Design a binder for this molecule. Structure first.
Ligand SMILES: Nc1ncc(C2=CCC([C@@]34C[C@@H]3CN(C3CCOCC3)C4)=CC2)cc1C(=O)N[C@]12CC[C@](O)(CC1)CC2
Lengths: 109, 318
């Protein structure tokens, strides 16, 4: 799909893909293109949860995680229009930043 | 409605900046229920909101003040600013374009409105002015180390930007005009906000435009001038010997409501006027001491003004 490239690190079950209204429980590490880590749920030892279709996360995450199956770990490379765009997130993400996330879909609730 | 694994805001803030982890800021911002508009101003509006049964303040910026949202979000995300007398940041989110800044909620409201609803005794007056001095000294002082912070000047200190906490102490809010400085690189980060300070509280050097804009120390002296004006507003409301003054903003008697830059420049620079000290303050030891402190914030020469740390120490001895 546009805006997000999915490179698999380890496979999921290949059959249980997130549906609209389901809660995705994931572990992630986010980095800028130069490898600078800006956020990681793995460092907090606390999985991150979001409801698919609610737009609680950037578009690249909604569309990238929807292509993953339960148990899958993948590297998502998200273009700036599918992330924080021209503004970025002041003090964390610069303008027009491509973001790289190592995401593991742990389970669906 | 509670699920196993759910965290409260306190747990999410315990962990990288002043607020929630980066991705968590958007998720939490987009899960808040707005409830009641508790303030409006040049900045836009502020609302009491709720997230999982917890109150938060949601500041929704006007289209005219987008650069203050950028600057305040930048500051709280790049500096770990966690102090009892500095408004706690939780999250910033962009969602027409809406710019949100979420912070702790202080149900007592601003000091400006608080001073109009009640009089103060020696206990509540000293708690207020000491807590403002403590927050201001924490902003001004640079801390070295990985648990440190650059020195920060506010540039818009005033009673409307100070919130009263449930315990009677205050916290300083609005870092949209703040400037940062670090001794290691002598780097001054002034930002790109065209906003200027509130006219009524502008120091003489800001009004006559002689302030040295590339000197961090100059911005600390502007904050000290404005602190002295806030001290005067608070002291007026402390009862002594059955007497108390009505709430008035600084320069109430010589400038109109919404004074212009020229109204202020004529009073403060041309005529070198300062707020008047009521005669009854000299009969009370606490007010006599505060009148002495106030005057030391109001010298025309900014270099003569005392530091936030010297104010805090003086207040700790009263
Ligand atoms: N963080 C915050 N938390 C809470 C507020 C409230 C403000 C006002 C109120 C009251 C109107 C409702 C009733 N009530 C009375 C009831 C009787 O008993 C005495 C008080 C006070 C309630 C809450 C504001 C902010 C905030 O951020 N304010 C600002 C003001 C200016 C700035 O520049 C910097 C901080 C932007 C927003």
């Amino acid at each position: 799909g546009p805006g997000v490239q999915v490179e698999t690190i380890s496979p999921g079950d290949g059959r249980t893909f997130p549906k609209r209204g389901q809660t995705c429980v994931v572990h992630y590490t986010g980095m800028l293109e130069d490898g600078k880590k800006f956020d990681s749920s793995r460092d907090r030892n606390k999985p991150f949860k979001f409801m698919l279709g609610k737009q609680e996360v950037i578009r690249g995450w909604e569309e990238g995680v929807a292509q993953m199956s339960v148990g899958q770990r993948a590297k998502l490379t998200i273009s700036p229009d599918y992330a924080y765009g021209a503004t970025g997130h002041p003090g964390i993400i610069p303008p027009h930043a491509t973001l790289v996330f190592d995401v593991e879909l742990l389970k669906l609730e | 409605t509670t699920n196993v694994g759910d965290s409260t805001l306190a747990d999410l803030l315990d962990h990288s900046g002043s607020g929630l982890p980066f991705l968590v800021q958007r998720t939490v911002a987009r899960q808040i229920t707005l409830l009641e508009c508790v303030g409006k101003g040049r900045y836009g509006e502020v609302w009491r909101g709720s997230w999982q049964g917890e109150n938060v303040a949601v500041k929704i910026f006007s289209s005219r003040d987008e650069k203050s949202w950028f600057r305040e979000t930048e500051l709280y995300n790049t500096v770990m600013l966690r102090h009892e007398n500095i408004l706690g940041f939780i999250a910033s989110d962009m969602t027409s374009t809406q710019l949100w800044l979420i912070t702790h909620y202080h149900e007592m409201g601003s000091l400006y409105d608080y001073l109009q609803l009640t009089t103060l005794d020696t206990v509540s007056c000293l708690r207020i002015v000491l807590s403002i001095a403590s927050g201001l000294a924490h902003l001004h002082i640079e801390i070295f180390g990985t648990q440190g912070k650059p020195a920060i000047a506010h540039r818009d200190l005033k009673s409307k930007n100070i919130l009263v906490k449930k315990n009677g102490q205050c916290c300083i809010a609005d870092l949209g005009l703040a400037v940062m400085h670090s001794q290691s690189t002598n780097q001054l980060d002034v930002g790109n906000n065209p906003r200027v300070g509130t006219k009524r509280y502008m120091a003489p050097e800001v009004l006559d435009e002689t302030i040295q804009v590339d000197c961090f120390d100059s911005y600390k002296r502007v904050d000290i001038w404005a602190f002295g004006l806030v001290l005067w507003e608070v002291a007026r409301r402390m009862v002594s010997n059955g007497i108390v003054e009505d709430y008035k903003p600084p320069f109430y008697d010589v400038v109109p409501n919404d004074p212009s830059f020229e109204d202020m420049r004529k009073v403060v620079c041309v005529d070198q006027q300062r707020p008047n000290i009521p005669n009854r303050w000299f009969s009370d030891p606490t007010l006599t001491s505060l009148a002495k402190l106030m005057k030391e914030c109001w010298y025309q020469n900014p270099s003569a003004r005392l530091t936030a740390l010297r104010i805090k120490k003086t207040l700790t001895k009263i």
